[PDB]
Design a binder for this molecule. Sequence first.
Ligand SMILES: [Zn+2]
Lengths: 21, 30
Amino acid sequence: GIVEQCCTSICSLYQLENYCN
Amino acid sequence: FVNQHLCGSHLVEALYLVCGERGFFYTPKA
Ligand SMILES: [Zn+2]
């Protein structure tokens, strides 16, 4: 999911925002 | 913003910046 994606590949802050409460 | 490569604790730091007072859920795969 996002944890793996950000580390194996790349990820954007906009994608990180999907994890906020 | 630019795309980033974030591993281990460095991803939790990013989430903390992005979400702030809203809080977040850190859910790695098992
Ligand atoms: Zn480090």
